[PDB]
Design a binder for this molecule. Structure first.
Ligand SMILES: CCCCCCO[C@@H]1O[C@H](CO)[C@H](O)[C@H](N)[C@H]1O[C@@H]1O[C@@H](C)[C@@H](O)[C@@H](O)[C@@H]1O
Ligand SMILES: [Hg+2]
Ligand SMILES: [Hg+2]
Ligand SMILES: [Hg+2]
Ligand SMILES: [Hg+2]
Length: 263
């Protein structure tokens, strides 16, 4: 909205692709975020000028509350550093939430287990799984109206191999000749409005399936993939944002491992 100040940085080269080893934009012109495709300095400026607030939601029920400490501590070092962050921890054990020291401009709310709340408190919602840890930068380069993350096991696979729900009886059904990517349900988000639309669409599709006595092969994730097939995300995050070094190592195609599973 407001003018960016004078900035000094390398001139982008029109005849020099940033990455030649991977696809950096989808067929519907949504960027695919890989290290080397963005200048974080320009992006931080753009979002700071808008005083952007990012909500980060995690669900820690039962034994998963044990992952909160590492999750929050690492988020403090790598997630949206410099911008306003509001952590939303949904848990069945309010008292078990660890007391983690937060940087300025960042807050955490514990919700024991309305959507209207999100609309007035944050500009974007990022929904992730709690049994993870941040190992590198995860910033505003991911912010957009709607984004999904490439599942680390299928980013190089053909659609036929994607583990979409294949039964026509399911609302999450996707035939073998359809599909752009296989997105993992452990990392998605976008504007509050778009995220609520996605979740509302998924919840309704799941109810319909339940009534028909059917459960999608990969539950929530199956419906997420159906939704993102019909409502193309405005950005797609590379596997840099959802990886497991123990199971997949550290391929050359990944210059950074930013968000990973906990052994
Ligand atoms: C970073 C995960 C590495 C790949 C492991 C296999 O992942 C599973 O893939 C299916 C779709 O084919 C679903 O996405 C499952 N939810 C994935 O399971 C993952 O691994 C298991 C062991 C659990 O940790 C689960 O929470 C993970 O998503
Ligand atoms: Hg969410
Ligand atoms: Hg979530
Ligand atoms: Hg759902
Ligand atoms: Hg969903």
């Amino acid at each position: 909205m407001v003018s960016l100040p004078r900035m000094v940085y390398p001139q982008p080269k029109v005849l020099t692709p940033c990455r030649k080893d991977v696809l950096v934009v989808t067929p519907w012109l949504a960027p695919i975020v890989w290290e080397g495709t963005f200048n974080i300095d320009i992006l931080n400026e753009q979002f700071r000028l808008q005083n952007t607030t990012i909500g980060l939601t995690v669900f820690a029920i039962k034994k998963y509350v044990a992952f909160l400490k590492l999750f929050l501590e690492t988020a403090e070092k790598h997630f949206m550093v410099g911008h306003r962050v509001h952590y939303y921890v949904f848990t069945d054990q309010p008292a078990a939430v660890p007391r983690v020291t937060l940087g300025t401009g960042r807050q955490l709310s514990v919700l024991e287990v309305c959507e209207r709340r999100f609309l007035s408190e944050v500009d974007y919602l990022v929904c992730v799984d709690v049994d993870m840890e941040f190992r590198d930068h995860v910033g505003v380069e991911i912010l957009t109206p709607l984004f999904g993350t490439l599942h680390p096991s299928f980013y190089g696979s053909s659609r036929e191999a994607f583990t979409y729900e294949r039964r026509p009886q399911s609302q999450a059904y996707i035939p073998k000749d359809e599909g752009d990517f296989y997105y993992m349900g452990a990392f998605f988000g976008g504007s509050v409005q778009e995220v609520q639309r996605l979740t509302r669409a998924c919840h309704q599709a799941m109810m319909v399936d339940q009534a028909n006595g059917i459960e999608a092969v990969w539950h929530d994730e199956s419906h997420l993939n159906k939704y993102l097939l019909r409502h193309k995300p405005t950005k797609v995050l590379s596997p840099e944002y959802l990886w497991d070094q123990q199971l997949l190592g550290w391929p050359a195609v990944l210059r950074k491992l930013r968000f990973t599973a906990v052994p």
